[PDB]
Amino acid sequence: MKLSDLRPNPGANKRRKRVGRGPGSGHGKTATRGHKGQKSRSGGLKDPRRFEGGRSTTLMRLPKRGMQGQVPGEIKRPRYQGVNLKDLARFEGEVTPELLVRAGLLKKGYRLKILGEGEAKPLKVVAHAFSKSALEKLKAAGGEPVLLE
Amino acid sequence: MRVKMHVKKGDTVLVASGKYKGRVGKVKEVLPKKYAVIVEGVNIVKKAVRVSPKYPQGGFIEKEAPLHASKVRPICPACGKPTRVRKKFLENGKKIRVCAKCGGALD
Amino acid sequence: PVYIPRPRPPHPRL
Amino acid sequence: GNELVRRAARNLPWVVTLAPEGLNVYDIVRTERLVMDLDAWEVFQNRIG
Amino acid sequence: PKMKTHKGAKKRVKITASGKVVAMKTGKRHLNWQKSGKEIRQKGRKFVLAKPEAERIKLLLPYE
RNA sequence: ACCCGGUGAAAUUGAACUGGCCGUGAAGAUGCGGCCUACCCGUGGCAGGACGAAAAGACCCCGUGGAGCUUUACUGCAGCC
RNA sequence: GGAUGACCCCAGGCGGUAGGGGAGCGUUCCCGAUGCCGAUGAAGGCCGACCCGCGAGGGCGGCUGGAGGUAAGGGAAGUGC
RNA sequence: GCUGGGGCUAGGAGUGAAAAGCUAACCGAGCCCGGAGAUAGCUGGUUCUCCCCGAAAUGACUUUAGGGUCAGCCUCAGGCG
RNA sequence: CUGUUGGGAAGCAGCGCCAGAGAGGGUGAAAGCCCCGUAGGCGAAAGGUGGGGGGAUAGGUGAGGGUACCCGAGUACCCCGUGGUUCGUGGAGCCAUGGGGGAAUCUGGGCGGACCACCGCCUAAGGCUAAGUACUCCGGGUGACCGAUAGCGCACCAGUACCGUGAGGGAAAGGUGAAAAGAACCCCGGGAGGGGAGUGAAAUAGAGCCUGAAACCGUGGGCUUACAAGCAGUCACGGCCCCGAGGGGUUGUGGCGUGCCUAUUGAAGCAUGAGCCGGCGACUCACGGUCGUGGGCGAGCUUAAGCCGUUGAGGCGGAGGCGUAGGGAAACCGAGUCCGAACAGGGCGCAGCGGCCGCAAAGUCCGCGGCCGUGGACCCGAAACCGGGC
RNA sequence: GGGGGGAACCUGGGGAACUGAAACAUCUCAGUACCCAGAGGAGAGGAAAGAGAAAUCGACUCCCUGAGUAGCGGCGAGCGA
Ligand SMILES: [Mg+2]
Ligand SMILES: [Mg+2]
Ligand SMILES: [Mg+2]
Ligand SMILES: [Mg+2]
Ligand SMILES: [Mg+2]
Ligand SMILES: [Mg+2]
Ligand SMILES: [Mg+2]
Ligand SMILES: [Mg+2]
Ligand SMILES: [Mg+2]
Ligand SMILES: [Mg+2]
Ligand SMILES: [Mg+2]
Ligand SMILES: [Mg+2]
Ligand SMILES: [Mg+2]
Ligand SMILES: [Mg+2]
Ligand SMILES: [Mg+2]
Ligand SMILES: [Mg+2]
Ligand SMILES: [Mg+2]
Ligand SMILES: [Mg+2]
Ligand SMILES: [Mg+2]
Ligand SMILES: [Mg+2]
Ligand SMILES: [Mg+2]
Ligand SMILES: [Mg+2]
Ligand SMILES: [Mg+2]
Ligand SMILES: [Mg+2]
Ligand SMILES: [Mg+2]
Ligand SMILES: [Mg+2]
Ligand SMILES: [Mg+2]
Ligand SMILES: [Mg+2]
Ligand SMILES: [Mg+2]
Ligand SMILES: [Mg+2]
Ligand SMILES: [Mg+2]
Ligand SMILES: [Mg+2]
Ligand SMILES: [Mg+2]
Ligand SMILES: [Mg+2]
Ligand SMILES: [Mg+2]
Ligand SMILES: [Mg+2]
Ligand SMILES: [Mg+2]
Ligand SMILES: [Mg+2]
Ligand SMILES: [Mg+2]
Ligand SMILES: [Mg+2]
Ligand SMILES: [Mg+2]
Ligand SMILES: [Mg+2]
Ligand SMILES: [Mg+2]
Ligand SMILES: [Mg+2]
Ligand SMILES: [Mg+2]
Ligand SMILES: [Mg+2]
Ligand SMILES: [Mg+2]
Ligand SMILES: [Mg+2]
Ligand SMILES: [Mg+2]
Ligand SMILES: [Mg+2]
Ligand SMILES: [Mg+2]
Ligand SMILES: [Mg+2]
Ligand SMILES: [Mg+2]
Ligand SMILES: [Mg+2]
Ligand SMILES: [Mg+2]
Ligand SMILES: [Mg+2]
Ligand SMILES: [Mg+2]
Ligand SMILES: [Mg+2]
Ligand SMILES: [Mg+2]
Ligand SMILES: [Mg+2]
Ligand SMILES: [Mg+2]
Ligand SMILES: [Mg+2]
Ligand SMILES: [Mg+2]
Ligand SMILES: [Mg+2]
Ligand SMILES: [Mg+2]
Ligand SMILES: [Mg+2]
Ligand SMILES: [Mg+2]
Ligand SMILES: [Mg+2]
Ligand SMILES: [Mg+2]
Ligand SMILES: [Mg+2]
Ligand SMILES: [Mg+2]
Ligand SMILES: [Mg+2]
Ligand SMILES: [Mg+2]
Ligand SMILES: [Mg+2]
Ligand SMILES: [Mg+2]
Ligand SMILES: [Mg+2]
Ligand SMILES: [Mg+2]
Ligand SMILES: [Mg+2]
Ligand SMILES: [Mg+2]
Ligand SMILES: [Mg+2]
Ligand SMILES: [Mg+2]
Ligand SMILES: [Mg+2]
Ligand SMILES: [Mg+2]
Ligand SMILES: [Mg+2]
Ligand SMILES: [Mg+2]
Ligand SMILES: [Mg+2]
Ligand SMILES: [Mg+2]
Ligand SMILES: [Mg+2]
Ligand SMILES: [Mg+2]
Ligand SMILES: [Mg+2]
Ligand SMILES: [Mg+2]
Ligand SMILES: [Mg+2]
Ligand SMILES: [Mg+2]
Ligand SMILES: [Mg+2]
Ligand SMILES: [Mg+2]
Ligand SMILES: [Mg+2]
Ligand SMILES: [Mg+2]
Ligand SMILES: [Mg+2]
Ligand SMILES: [Mg+2]
Ligand SMILES: [Mg+2]
Ligand SMILES: [Mg+2]
Ligand SMILES: [Mg+2]
Ligand SMILES: [Mg+2]
Ligand SMILES: [Mg+2]
Ligand SMILES: [Mg+2]
Ligand SMILES: [Mg+2]
Ligand SMILES: [Mg+2]
Ligand SMILES: [Mg+2]
Ligand SMILES: [Mg+2]
Ligand SMILES: [Mg+2]
Ligand SMILES: [Mg+2]
Ligand SMILES: [Mg+2]
Ligand SMILES: [Mg+2]
Ligand SMILES: [Mg+2]
Ligand SMILES: [Mg+2]
Ligand SMILES: [Mg+2]
Ligand SMILES: [Mg+2]
Ligand SMILES: [Mg+2]
Ligand SMILES: [Mg+2]
Ligand SMILES: [Mg+2]
Ligand SMILES: [Mg+2]
Ligand SMILES: [Mg+2]
Ligand SMILES: [Mg+2]
Ligand SMILES: [Mg+2]
Ligand SMILES: [Mg+2]
Ligand SMILES: [Mg+2]
Ligand SMILES: [Mg+2]
Ligand SMILES: [Mg+2]
Ligand SMILES: [Mg+2]
Ligand SMILES: [Mg+2]
Ligand SMILES: [Mg+2]
Ligand SMILES: [Mg+2]
Ligand SMILES: [Mg+2]
Ligand SMILES: [Mg+2]
Ligand SMILES: [Mg+2]
Ligand SMILES: [Mg+2]
Ligand SMILES: [Mg+2]
Ligand SMILES: [Mg+2]
Ligand SMILES: [Mg+2]
Ligand SMILES: [Mg+2]
Ligand SMILES: [Mg+2]
Ligand SMILES: [Mg+2]
Ligand SMILES: [Mg+2]
Ligand SMILES: [Mg+2]
Ligand SMILES: [Mg+2]
Ligand SMILES: [Mg+2]
Ligand SMILES: [Mg+2]
Ligand SMILES: [Mg+2]
Ligand SMILES: [Mg+2]
Ligand SMILES: [Mg+2]
Ligand SMILES: [Mg+2]
Ligand SMILES: [Mg+2]
Ligand SMILES: [Mg+2]
Ligand SMILES: [Mg+2]
Ligand SMILES: [Mg+2]
Ligand SMILES: [Mg+2]
Ligand SMILES: [Mg+2]
Ligand SMILES: [Mg+2]
Ligand SMILES: [Mg+2]
Ligand SMILES: [Mg+2]
Ligand SMILES: [Mg+2]
Ligand SMILES: [Mg+2]
Ligand SMILES: [Mg+2]
Ligand SMILES: [Mg+2]
Ligand SMILES: [Mg+2]
Ligand SMILES: [Mg+2]
Ligand SMILES: [Mg+2]
Ligand SMILES: [Mg+2]
Ligand SMILES: [Mg+2]
Ligand SMILES: [Mg+2]
Ligand SMILES: [Mg+2]
Ligand SMILES: [Mg+2]
Ligand SMILES: [Mg+2]
Ligand SMILES: [Mg+2]
Ligand SMILES: [Mg+2]
Ligand SMILES: [Mg+2]
Ligand SMILES: [Mg+2]
Ligand SMILES: [Mg+2]
Ligand SMILES: [Mg+2]
Ligand SMILES: [Mg+2]
Ligand SMILES: [Mg+2]
Ligand SMILES: [Mg+2]
Ligand SMILES: [Mg+2]
Ligand SMILES: [Mg+2]
Ligand SMILES: [Mg+2]
Ligand SMILES: [Mg+2]
Ligand SMILES: [Mg+2]
Ligand SMILES: [Mg+2]
Ligand SMILES: [Mg+2]
Ligand SMILES: [Mg+2]
Ligand SMILES: [Mg+2]
Ligand SMILES: [Mg+2]
Ligand SMILES: [Mg+2]
Ligand SMILES: [Mg+2]
Ligand SMILES: [Mg+2]
Ligand SMILES: [Mg+2]
Ligand SMILES: [Mg+2]
Ligand SMILES: [Mg+2]
Ligand SMILES: [Mg+2]
Ligand SMILES: [Mg+2]
Ligand SMILES: [Mg+2]
Ligand SMILES: [Mg+2]
Ligand SMILES: [Mg+2]
Ligand SMILES: [Mg+2]
Ligand SMILES: [Mg+2]
Ligand SMILES: [Mg+2]
Ligand SMILES: [Mg+2]
Ligand SMILES: [Mg+2]
Ligand SMILES: [Mg+2]
Ligand SMILES: [Mg+2]
Ligand SMILES: [Mg+2]
Ligand SMILES: [Mg+2]
Ligand SMILES: [Mg+2]
Ligand SMILES: [Mg+2]
Ligand SMILES: [Mg+2]
Ligand SMILES: [Mg+2]
Ligand SMILES: [Mg+2]
Ligand SMILES: [Mg+2]
Ligand SMILES: [Mg+2]
Ligand SMILES: [Mg+2]
Ligand SMILES: [Mg+2]
Ligand SMILES: [Mg+2]
Ligand SMILES: [Mg+2]
Ligand SMILES: [Mg+2]
Ligand SMILES: [Mg+2]
Ligand SMILES: [Zn+2]
Fold first, then answer.
1. Which of A62, A87, D13, D46 could form a disulfide with E23 if both were Cys (CB 3.0 to 4.6 A apart)?
2. Do the Cβ atoms of A59 and E59 come within 8 Å?
3. Strands B85-89, B12-15: parallel, antiparallel or unpaired by DSSP?
4. Which residues, by Cβ under 5 Å, contact ligand 226, an ion?
């Protein structure tokens, strides 16, 4: 396999869409823009995600709801991320929040809570919280819940 | 600083290429600004001259044209061959050119 | 030609 | 990894020279055959483990 | 530079787990005395936006 | 002004092998149709046409364009109380 | 049909502005290239009633020119008036 | 009264026996360089080839009406059949 | 080194050689070994530097107990007016401070988003401090950077010529040849120019110089035309000239035939642009997004800045991001959750194909393409507004 | 000792408008452009009357990240630790 053999697959390197280069191209003259609008112009239209021609936009006619917040911003409370038992099916022995961050399961700075979805395994699982279901399943399967703090 | 001249005025050189390849002759002149040399009896050309003092009757005279100094190779005054020039130092501390084939000096 | 002669005034079509 | 051996072969027009730490695929594909230290083969066995 | 979340959108709308967009009904901010209980009740509920309009709002919330 | 000798511009200019009538056509045709008339090329003259040239119409409208000016329009600022 | 463009057979579609889509050509540059074409003539120019391609183009030959040019396969754009 | 020489007053400022006059051959706000590639829902222009498909000039809302948002109508990929 | 073609060898041929050097540029064409270099080494009396090695100096240094002496003043602190912060008067603290009032010295005082308590953090109103950071007049190195309408405005005697009272504006213009061998001398001519001679491989390479396109101007030759109606062509036939059962040039007659572009419901249109030719000339990049797509990995995927290595070598780095769980304004609950008194009802949610292994895949990373957002964002164009100058 | 000069860079004192908000005034543009003073090979800053919830950390500057998060906002356009 030499350098004259290195080839991208079909469809890996498509050509681009060069506009305004002649009649045959199918893209000449108006560069696929049509005729004479604000959208034809360099700088186009206002943000077509919001702008609705001058009328009240569909987004601004809906009401707000909830606590938006106020200076000085977010209030620091303990955050809880949950993990279902089925996710734990890979570990033996002990489960801790520290042990699960490295599994790509429980993001840092989040208190660990175990949830019901899955099947409890006879494990020692250390966690800041357990649902009613995961608690019930866990005792029944020989595992020891350890509510820490 | 200075242009580097493997060859100098007066020593015998061989012309190694061109119409006169093979010729041997003493270096009449060295033109550093043009990286060239004038070799005796080599590279003759025909110069027209106007009727004037020092040139009555007028016509043409033969002058020697310059050669790119790269077409010239010094002939070792000992072993008698053309050679590249080496640099040998002396006990004096000075530095002279020396033949590469044998070890002779070329000055 | 940095000097442009000013154009003649148009015939008043009012 | 032998500095002496790379220095010997660097000037051959048919030789690309390389330290094991620099084993790349462009230079492998650039060339028709490969030659490695058993010391460097250990280094290649690490980098693809 | 990187895009900015539109804050009117975030404050009015929520993107659901499958990608729908949901909003409070309109109509019960005031003038409610002569309105049916059915009308105040029905509008207490959230509602799914029409697809053409939801996909526009979703582009305003690129970091949810 | 005209003719001969000397020097020699310009705006304008899709190309042009560039006639009349009665029609036709984006509604006023050298350029289409049917007729009629007409050998090729100039020079001095005249201005009816080439919707002749020149100036991206001043009028008029349009633009969520501009500028001056006004006031018991809005909102400020200097000033003064 | 043969067995997944490997070519053949039969039948049908194939006017086109805005515009959507597909496949190609050519320009400059990089890898291929310490290679290969080149003064027994590079690129550029001027012809051609010749060859290939639907085409954009590509060859080939003659004149000019006098020192560069650059493959199959890919890569990137100041890429075609 | 006219005039030479020497001076002073300028850009929202000066000067004006008042015309919005004049302030270096266009002044209802000078000239230069800069902000600056102001902004222009307007006009103009937008370059190689072949192949398949192929619109709209309507409705609703719009300080909107020659501009837009959504629908309608076109095209491409995947799925259904 | 030799031979050979050649004006010229470095091309080609024969036989060698060096290489820690086969980067590159020259030399009459294409050279590792001819030249300049390159690898690898070496080098400063004098001046500059010296962040590193060394020396020196300044400087630095304990307790208990008592005492309550000192601990930065128009300051803290409160109020008024404002500025800075993500904070636009807001529940508005903190930091700064123009005005008024105006303390204390550690049992003093400031802060932790009005305030108060508790629990804590910190010691205002004097000053100084390298490095890591920014920039590029200047020197060097390197380019999937330009190649004379390009690249700096300037490859060149350019911030010049020229323009403007002035601030200021602001160009065009590169190339003989390997070597000047740059054409003695003679002829026509006032000269300019030319014709011979001569140089050169080449002189329509002759200095008004490499190549030398097009518009444009001219000389010569073939066909053609003075009874003819025209977007200039096309189709047919005939004639004449040329090249050798065909082809090329020309055009007499007959047929047919309303330029190009733009804008438009609609133009040949008496609507727009263009005298003609040559060159310049307009959909891009960045970062984010959203689909699609070629790959990698897959309940996981992936690193940023840096650090090491290379000097067109790659590696390390898991901080972080996306995903693995949703529902609710939230407290919170969780395969559910929210409304509700509800076990009601509803809203939003939840659950691969083969034979333990293989193919696949949620996801995610990279490449590529289309489109979107922020940027001038397809290119050219105002009238104007502002700042500082003249 | 000072004075003056220096392409960008830096700190301080002052400080716009077009534009965007498809009008406009708060807001945006932006403490940008620019004027001024000062500085140096860098400038600024710097050794806690800090941060802000950890029963924590430990000068300052700079890069990555945190994050377009927290927030701010005619809760508009946007702004943004
Ligand atoms: Mg590409
Ligand atoms: Mg395409
Ligand atoms: Mg292309
Ligand atoms: Mg085309
Ligand atoms: Mg089209
Ligand atoms: Mg478009
Ligand atoms: Mg258009
Ligand atoms: Mg139109
Ligand atoms: Mg249209
Ligand atoms: Mg147009
Ligand atoms: Mg239109
Ligand atoms: Mg349009
Ligand atoms: Mg649209
Ligand atoms: Mg357009
Ligand atoms: Mg523009
Ligand atoms: Mg616009
Ligand atoms: Mg309205
Ligand atoms: Mg509200
Ligand atoms: Mg929130
Ligand atoms: Mg000496
Ligand atoms: Mg002019
Ligand atoms: Mg005129
Ligand atoms: Mg080498
Ligand atoms: Mg090598
Ligand atoms: Mg090689
Ligand atoms: Mg809002
Ligand atoms: Mg919500
Ligand atoms: Mg209410
Ligand atoms: Mg009623
Ligand atoms: Mg009721
Ligand atoms: Mg009621
Ligand atoms: Mg209710
Ligand atoms: Mg996030
Ligand atoms: Mg006469
Ligand atoms: Mg005359
Ligand atoms: Mg004269
Ligand atoms: Mg003229
Ligand atoms: Mg014509
Ligand atoms: Mg004609
Ligand atoms: Mg005629
Ligand atoms: Mg009519
Ligand atoms: Mg009629
Ligand atoms: Mg008529
Ligand atoms: Mg006629
Ligand atoms: Mg016609
Ligand atoms: Mg007709
Ligand atoms: Mg007629
Ligand atoms: Mg007729
Ligand atoms: Mg008649
Ligand atoms: Mg006449
Ligand atoms: Mg007339
Ligand atoms: Mg007339
Ligand atoms: Mg007339
Ligand atoms: Mg006219
Ligand atoms: Mg006209
Ligand atoms: Mg105009
Ligand atoms: Mg007009
Ligand atoms: Mg006009
Ligand atoms: Mg007037
Ligand atoms: Mg009108
Ligand atoms: Mg008007
Ligand atoms: Mg209006
Ligand atoms: Mg309007
Ligand atoms: Mg207006
Ligand atoms: Mg105004
Ligand atoms: Mg004004
Ligand atoms: Mg105004
Ligand atoms: Mg008064
Ligand atoms: Mg078909
Ligand atoms: Mg078609
Ligand atoms: Mg191509
Ligand atoms: Mg490659
Ligand atoms: Mg190469
Ligand atoms: Mg050869
Ligand atoms: Mg030759
Ligand atoms: Mg030849
Ligand atoms: Mg070429
Ligand atoms: Mg080329
Ligand atoms: Mg060809
Ligand atoms: Mg040729
Ligand atoms: Mg060369
Ligand atoms: Mg190539
Ligand atoms: Mg290619
Ligand atoms: Mg371009
Ligand atoms: Mg007097
Ligand atoms: Mg006087
Ligand atoms: Mg005077
Ligand atoms: Mg005065
Ligand atoms: Mg004055
Ligand atoms: Mg002044
Ligand atoms: Mg003014
Ligand atoms: Mg003004
Ligand atoms: Mg005044
Ligand atoms: Mg007077
Ligand atoms: Mg003036
Ligand atoms: Mg005047
Ligand atoms: Mg004005
Ligand atoms: Mg004036
Ligand atoms: Mg200036
Ligand atoms: Mg600006
Ligand atoms: Mg701009
Ligand atoms: Mg405007
Ligand atoms: Mg069709
Ligand atoms: Mg309609
Ligand atoms: Mg409009
Ligand atoms: Mg639509
Ligand atoms: Mg349909
Ligand atoms: Mg569709
Ligand atoms: Mg010979
Ligand atoms: Mg030889
Ligand atoms: Mg040989
Ligand atoms: Mg090397
Ligand atoms: Mg080389
Ligand atoms: Mg070389
Ligand atoms: Mg070779
Ligand atoms: Mg070469
Ligand atoms: Mg060489
Ligand atoms: Mg060295
Ligand atoms: Mg060296
Ligand atoms: Mg005391
Ligand atoms: Mg103190
Ligand atoms: Mg503020
Ligand atoms: Mg404030
Ligand atoms: Mg508030
Ligand atoms: Mg505050
Ligand atoms: Mg306070
Ligand atoms: Mg304060
Ligand atoms: Mg105060
Ligand atoms: Mg205060
Ligand atoms: Mg205390
Ligand atoms: Mg106290
Ligand atoms: Mg304080
Ligand atoms: Mg406090
Ligand atoms: Mg605090
Ligand atoms: Mg503290
Ligand atoms: Mg202190
Ligand atoms: Mg300092
Ligand atoms: Mg520093
Ligand atoms: Mg430099
Ligand atoms: Mg340099
Ligand atoms: Mg080049
Ligand atoms: Mg030039
Ligand atoms: Mg130039
Ligand atoms: Mg040229
Ligand atoms: Mg050019
Ligand atoms: Mg160029
Ligand atoms: Mg120039
Ligand atoms: Mg320069
Ligand atoms: Mg000059
Ligand atoms: Mg000057
Ligand atoms: Mg003057
Ligand atoms: Mg002057
Ligand atoms: Mg030359
Ligand atoms: Mg020369
Ligand atoms: Mg030569
Ligand atoms: Mg010379
Ligand atoms: Mg004579
Ligand atoms: Mg002469
Ligand atoms: Mg003659
Ligand atoms: Mg002569
Ligand atoms: Mg020859
Ligand atoms: Mg020639
Ligand atoms: Mg020549
Ligand atoms: Mg040449
Ligand atoms: Mg020539
Ligand atoms: Mg010529
Ligand atoms: Mg010629
Ligand atoms: Mg003739
Ligand atoms: Mg007759
Ligand atoms: Mg006849
Ligand atoms: Mg006709
Ligand atoms: Mg016939
Ligand atoms: Mg024939
Ligand atoms: Mg014929
Ligand atoms: Mg005919
Ligand atoms: Mg055309
Ligand atoms: Mg029009
Ligand atoms: Mg019209
Ligand atoms: Mg016509
Ligand atoms: Mg016309
Ligand atoms: Mg006409
Ligand atoms: Mg007209
Ligand atoms: Mg028009
Ligand atoms: Mg036009
Ligand atoms: Mg003209
Ligand atoms: Mg012409
Ligand atoms: Mg052209
Ligand atoms: Mg694009
Ligand atoms: Mg770009
Ligand atoms: Mg994309
Ligand atoms: Mg992708
Ligand atoms: Mg992977
Ligand atoms: Mg896979
Ligand atoms: Mg990774
Ligand atoms: Mg409840
Ligand atoms: Mg439910
Ligand atoms: Mg359900
Ligand atoms: Mg994938
Ligand atoms: Mg899009
Ligand atoms: Mg921009
Ligand atoms: Mg742009
Ligand atoms: Mg764009
Ligand atoms: Mg003006
Ligand atoms: Mg203003
Ligand atoms: Mg001003
Ligand atoms: Mg001023
Ligand atoms: Mg100074
Ligand atoms: Mg400041
Ligand atoms: Mg001001
Ligand atoms: Mg403003
Ligand atoms: Mg702007
Ligand atoms: Mg404004
Ligand atoms: Mg606006
Ligand atoms: Mg606007
Ligand atoms: Mg306005
Ligand atoms: Mg601001
Ligand atoms: Mg400043
Ligand atoms: Mg200074
Ligand atoms: Mg430094
Ligand atoms: Mg410092
Ligand atoms: Mg300091
Ligand atoms: Mg201290
Ligand atoms: Mg407000
Ligand atoms: Mg903002
Ligand atoms: Mg701001
Ligand atoms: Zn010797």
1. A62
2. no
3. unpaired
4. B 76, 78-79, 99, 101-102, 104
